[PDB]
């Protein structure tokens, strides 16, 4: 419960420190470009802490109902991918510049960094496009949890699977390849518990659907995102003259 509050309390200093790519004083370096990209991503993520807090903590539901829930989650969901996607590309940077510094005739222009950021945003929109034909309508338990979905489909396994690859299979592999110690622990404790939880409901409801024993890893996912939002901002002569001789 308090994980989201701690996330906001630790994030707002980061949002302030972002301050127009770090104070609008240092040059528009590609490193500053990726810093601004991740600042935009986690600021868009941080814009909706009250919504997620009301989702699970405040009365276990949102006041606006179907008008809020979907939209909120939708936006969060998409930029959530963007956020981890951002990690990958900045991790992709963390390799290229640091494995054997050669980044001179490669991705060394502001235009190529802006185009890359636009490409990542387009990829986030493309992956959230399937999620657009989702979200729920009502909730028949006098509690407006925004459930019961709509006319949609046996195909719910593949969406969770592709979420797993875009979330853990590729990002963790890229991060491990980039790090190589000296040629990441927070990310391991953030993304893995969520995907492990997802696998947990998947395998159980495959044959023996979950029940009164309960399955409520939503606060666990909130705590993992809290750890991520705490970590990411935190980790991120004279002149030559002449004389006379014989």
């Amino acid at each position: 419960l308090v994980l989201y509050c701690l996330a906001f309390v630790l994030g707002i200093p980061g949002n302030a420190i972002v301050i127009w790519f770090t104070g609008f004083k240092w040059k528009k370096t590609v490193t500053t470009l990726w810093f601004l990209n991740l600042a935009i991503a986690d600021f868009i993520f941080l814009l909706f802490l009250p919504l997620y807090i009301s989702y699970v903590a405040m009365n276990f539901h949102w006041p606006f109902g179907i008008w809020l829930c979907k939209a909120n989650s939708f936006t969060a969901q998409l930029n959530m991918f963007a956020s981890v996607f951002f990690l990958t590309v900045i991790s992709l940077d963390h390799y290229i510049h640091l494995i054997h510094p050669v980044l001179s005739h490669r991705h060394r222009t502001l235009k190529n960094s802006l185009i890359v950021i636009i490409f990542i945003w387009l990829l986030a929109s493309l992956i959230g496009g399937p999620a657009l034909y989702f979200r729920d309508t009502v909730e028949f338990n006098n509690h407006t949890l925004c459930y019961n979905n709509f006319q949609k489909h046996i195909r719910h396994h593949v969406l969770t699977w592709v979420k797993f690859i875009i979330g853990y299979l590729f990002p963790l592999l890229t991060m491990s390849i980039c790090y190589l110690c000296l040629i990441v622990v927070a990310f391991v404790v953030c993304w893995t518990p969520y995907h492990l939880f997802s696998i947990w409901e998947l395998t159980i409801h495959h044959n023996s659907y979950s029940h009164h024993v309960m399955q409520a890893g939503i606060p666990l996912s909130t705590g993992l995102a809290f750890l991520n939002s705490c970590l990411n901002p935190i980790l991120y002569s004279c002149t030559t003259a002449s004389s006379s001789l014989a």
């Binding site: 989650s73 459930y147 009164h212």
Partner: peptide
Amino acid sequence: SFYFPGQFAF
């Protein structure tokens, strides 16, 4: 149906 998969939870 007591714990029917809600979906869209996150």
